Ligand SMILES: Fc1cccc(Cl)c1-c1nc(Br)c(-c2ccc(C#Cc3ccc(C(F)(F)F)cc3)nc2)[nH]1
Ligand SMILES: Fc1cccc(Cl)c1-c1nc(Br)c(-c2ccc(C#Cc3ccc(C(F)(F)F)cc3)nc2)[nH]1
Ligand SMILES: Fc1cccc(Cl)c1-c1nc(Br)c(-c2ccc(C#Cc3ccc(C(F)(F)F)cc3)nc2)[nH]1
Ligand SMILES: CCCCCCCCO[C@@H]1O[C@H](CO)[C@@H](O)[C@H](O)[C@H]1O
Ligand SMILES: CCCCCCCCO[C@@H]1O[C@H](CO)[C@@H](O)[C@H](O)[C@H]1O
Ligand SMILES: CCCCCCCCO[C@@H]1O[C@H](CO)[C@@H](O)[C@H](O)[C@H]1O
């Protein structure tokens with residue numbers, strides 16, 4: 001973990017976000033059980049009958065939050081890892097990772113909590129900023145080593 | 147690949163799981179063709195007419211299996227890679243990777259094979275256990291190097 | 293970035309593809325706004341009323357393109373990174389990465405541009421070829437170091 005000064009901070013933030021995604025998955029299952037809304041007939045028959053194989057708006061919302069996480073957190077896992085080895089200023093790197101972590105946690109809260117628009121959208125944009133920044137820096141480093 | 151004793155086992159299991167995901171993608175395409183159920187009008191017109199731009203329960207099932215793979219296998223690719231470099235006991239590491247591999251292969255079999263509930267759900271939980279374990283260990287390593 | 297001769301080319305192609313995914317996300321948002329088709333009631337109420345919480349075929353198409361990217365580009369991020377450290381011929385490695393990059397950019401153009409079938413499908417197959425190749429090579433390297 002000491003292979004570069006920014007790496008521990010990256011690994012802390014990334015792993016917290018992976019755990020946060022696992023939390024969303026758990027919540028999704030709990031909502032399916034509570035609302036009796038299952039995607040598979042075999043699940044529905046286990047949990048009350050075939051009429052419970054149905055969509056539910058809260059379940060769909062959970063799925064959207066989880067999908068948005070996959071669209072954003074997964075690229076961060078790649079970009080942040082690579083960026084950690086490019087010798088960025090440690091404090092600047094810390095700020096990139098912290099902005100992403102705070103933005104993404106806020107995003108899930110805003111999504112699952114049904115907060116008014118554009119609160120969720122703002123948190124999405126906020127978290128994308130450090131990702132865009134890291135992507136550009138990686139582009140320059142890669143291009144210049146060709 | 148010899149940069150840490152656990153790494154070869156990790157790379158074997160991870161790559162098999164990526165290949166397994168590719169298999170799911172291939173199956174999905176085959177089901178679309180067999181059931182004549184396409185997501186795009188251009189595809190439908192190529193394969194029999196506009197009435198074949200339609201949903202199908204078997205196609206939707208394939209998509210759910212593939213999505214669940216992305217929700218679980220992708221985090222494993224990150225966590226298992228990092229975990230491999232934290233000097234875990236080689237046999238303990240092997241068991242983490244093997245439980246994930248077996249659990250995930252079983253999950254796809256249970257999903258696509260339409261096995262009774264909660265067989266699929268149990269395999270999901272089983273495979274998440276080593277991921278949770280690795281995530282916590284990474285958290286501790288990262289936090290302590292801050 | 294100089295830890296292996298193929299790594300800079302990999303990092304260039306991967307980061308361009310991550311940026312390309314961000315472009316798809318931006319396009320998706322623009323289409324939602326233009327077509328007034330939102331997934332969340334809170335979004336719809338901010339942007340004209342509850343009747344705009346609705347599906348739209350162009351939005352759904354954008355989501356499919358983005359999902360297919362996650363199904364293919366994310367595994368490439370893993371496979372290409374590992375493959376870069378296995379000492380492949382630099383030119384051969386370059387060709388693997390370039391075929392994937394060109395295939396995937398073409399895929400998004402074919403998908404969002406609604407090009408006739410099977411143009412999109414061909415680009416998908418084309419880009420999967422270097423991924424399959426890298427996966428097999430990693431399997432052999434991992435297996436032989438067990
Ligand atoms: F585009 C959409 C498609 C579908 C559904 C919705 Cl709800 C929308 C949507 N409506 C609005 Br109004 C926004 C919006 C509004 C504002 C910002 C920012 C921002 C931002 C500005 C500055 C910073 C900072 F602090 F870094 F400088 C951060 C975020 N993002 C997004 N998005
Ligand atoms: F929650 C849901 C939401 C939607 C649809 C469904 Cl079908 C469900 C659902 N119904 C049941 Br009953 C389960 C369930 C039941 C059991 C276990 C375990 C487990 C487990 C226990 C011990 C181990 C071991 F071996 F490591 F100790 C492994 C797995 N997981 C899940 N899930
Ligand atoms: F299977 C489907 C399911 C759902 C919807 C659709 Cl639209 C389809 C589908 N219909 C056709 Br016809 C194809 C198709 C046709 C051709 C190739 C290739 C290829 C290929 C061959 C050689 C190379 C090369 F250059 F490397 F040698 C590359 C790609 N892929 C796919 N796919
Ligand atoms: C990491 C996971 C974060 C979970 C945050 C969940 C926030 C839920 O918050 C709740 O949401 C409800 C709407 O769903 C509202 O009715 C409640 O007022 C609100 O407290
Ligand atoms: C909303 C889209 C705006 C793009 C986000 C701004 C990203 C800024 O990113 C910056 O780019 C500079 C030039 O490449 C680099 O020198 C900096 O290191 C980098 O932080
Ligand atoms: C890695 C990919 C694993 C593919 C496992 C496919 C298991 C399919 O198995 C089949 O499923 C059918 C229901 O779909 C059942 O009707 C059949 O009895 C069963 O044999």
Ligand SMILES: CCCCCCCCO[C@@H]1O[C@H](CO)[C@@H](O)[C@H](O)[C@H]1O
Nearest residue numbers: 274275276277278279280282283286
């Ligand atoms: C279903 C949710 C239960 C969580 C899964 C159990 C994970 C146990 O994981 C364990 O955690 C310990 C304390 O952090 C560590 O010392 C061990 O190395 C680790 O294996």
Ligand SMILES: CCCCCCCCO[C@@H]1O[C@H](CO)[C@@H](O)[C@H](O)[C@H]1O
Nearest residue numbers: 312315316397400401402404405406
């Ligand atoms: C990286 C992102 C690539 C974006 C490529 C967008 C291609 C859009 O291309 C447009 O598509 C329309 C159908 O949607 C057609 O009607 C137009 O003829 C075509 O120019």
Ligand SMILES: CCCCCCCCO[C@@H]1O[C@H](CO)[C@@H](O)[C@H](O)[C@H]1O
Nearest residue numbers: 420421422423424425426428429432
């Ligand atoms: C459409 C499915 C066809 C599979 C794609 C072909 C992948 C070829 O991949 C090749 O495999 C050889 C044997 O493992 C290796 O020696 C080569 O290094 C590798 O490039």
Ligand SMILES: N[C@@H](CCC(=O)N[C@@H](CS)C(=O)NCC(=O)O)C(=O)O
Nearest residue numbers: 064065068120121124317318320321
């Ligand atoms: N797949 C996204 C692409 C754009 C995006 O990520 N938008 C942000 C800001 S509005 C978001 O929070 N989307 C909600 C979601 O993905 O469900 C979508 O459909 O909205």
Ligand SMILES: N[C@@H](CCC(=O)N[C@@H](CS)C(=O)NCC(=O)O)C(=O)O
Nearest residue numbers: 025026028029210211214266267270
């Ligand atoms: N996205 C998941 C979140 C929870 C989850 O992954 N559940 C496991 C155990 S029930 C599963 O196999 N889900 C089936 C699926 O994702 O389609 C869901 O909708 O179920």
Ligand SMILES: N[C@@H](CCC(=O)N[C@@H](CS)C(=O)NCC(=O)O)C(=O)O
Nearest residue numbers: 171172174175356357360412413416
């Ligand atoms: N999830 C895919 C699995 C197979 C696949 O990726 N097919 C390619 C070639 S036809 C594709 O472009 N799919 C379009 C899509 O994923 O929406 C699907 O439903 O089609």
